[PDB]
């Protein structure tokens, strides 16, 4: 259970990529934005071709088996992308998260 909250800055032009651990056994690896009001977790990026409706076409998945870092990148920032993005595995999304971190706008 890792909690590496980083302060990577963002903007419209700006791009921030998160780093995540991979089991490398070709399971379901996902990044999920937790919703405070909902109390559940909503997958923003998954192993399959699913992408969140708000994040359609502005996100990229980048997997290296060589270096054991699982990383996802966001092309543009609307400044609303401030929340607990947690990575993970297994079919489940909520109860399967491995590491969580909250990104940030401006700085």
């Amino acid at each position: 259970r890792i909690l590496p909250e980083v302060k990577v800055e963002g903007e419209l032009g700006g791009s921030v990529t998160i780093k995540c651990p991979l089991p490398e056994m070709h399971v379901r690896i996902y990044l999920c934005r937790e919703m405070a009001g909902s109390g559940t977790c909503g997958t923003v990026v998954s192993t399959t071709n699913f992408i969140k409706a708000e994040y359609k076409g502005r996100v990229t998945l980048k997997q290296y088996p060589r270096k054991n870092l699982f990383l996802v990148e966001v092309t543009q920032l609307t400044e609303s992308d401030s929340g607990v993005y947690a990575c993970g595995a297994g079919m489940n999304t909520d109860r399967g998260k491995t590491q969580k971190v909250t990104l940030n706008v401006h700085s």
Partner: protein, 228 residues
């Protein structure tokens, strides 16, 4: 005239692994140049005996003899006899000492709540019950560091009331009250012949014992079907 012979004890074979028969002859007449020997049942001799004490304060001579044998020479039932002679009785006086089952559990009782309210000294007690035969050992270790007998004591081994099968012994340790704000877990280690490794280390601290608040938090989910 006083002659005795003692076999090795379990407080030396575990502490040093130096099993040896001893022969103590004292309160005889003051005449030196005496001979001491140890003879087995087969006809094997022993090693030399030295380190004789000085004359007793009440004007008599002492004498000590040692029989250093192998470890298996005492667990295989070999009788040993101590030859000691004197200037007055021409016959060589001889003495024979011979031989010694259940394995019983250690139990560590924590100090009572009333004793801790005095803020002076809590005594931890270690009960070794149901063990046969006697001479069972005990040692206290604080954080894995050996505890000397200056700060602990053991009941000399004893007998049971309803069953005569195994006998009991006890050990109590003394400390302060500030020590029971950190614990150090005060392990009680034992050494008895009816043990695999001759060690049954047990330890109890404040974390274990009787707790004063349970909150079970059983949850029920319809999708936690593989307890991650």
């Amino acid at each position: 005239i006083r002659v005795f012979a003692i076999p090795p004890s379990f407080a030396s074979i575990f502490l040093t692994k130096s099993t040896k028969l001893t022969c103590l002859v004292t309160d005889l007449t003051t005449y030196d140049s005496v001979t001491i020997s140890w003879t087995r049942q087969n006809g094997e001799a022993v090693k030399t005996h030295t380190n004789i004490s000085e004359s007793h304060p009440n004007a008599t001579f002492s004498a000590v003899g040692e029989a250093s044998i192998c470890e298996d020479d005492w667990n295989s039932g070999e009788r040993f006899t101590c030859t000691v002679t004197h200037t007055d009785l021409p016959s060589p006086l001889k003495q024979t000492i011979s031989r010694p089952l259940h394995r019983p559990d250690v139990y560590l009782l924590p100090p009572a709540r009333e004793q801790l309210n005095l803020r002076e000294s809590a005594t931890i007690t270690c009960l070794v019950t149901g063990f046969s035969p006697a001479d069972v050992f005990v040692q206290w270790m604080q954080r894995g560091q050996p505890l000397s007998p200056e700060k602990y004591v053991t009941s000399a081994p004893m007998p049971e009331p309803q069953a005569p099968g195994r006998y009991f012994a006890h050990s109590i340790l003394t400390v302060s009250e500030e020590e029971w704000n950190t614990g150090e877990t005060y392990t009680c280690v034992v050494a008895h012949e009816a043990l695999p490794n001759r060690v049954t280390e047990r330890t109890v601290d404040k974390s274990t014992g009787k707790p004063t608040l349970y909150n079970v938090s059983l949850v029920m989910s319809d999708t936690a079907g593989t307890c991650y």
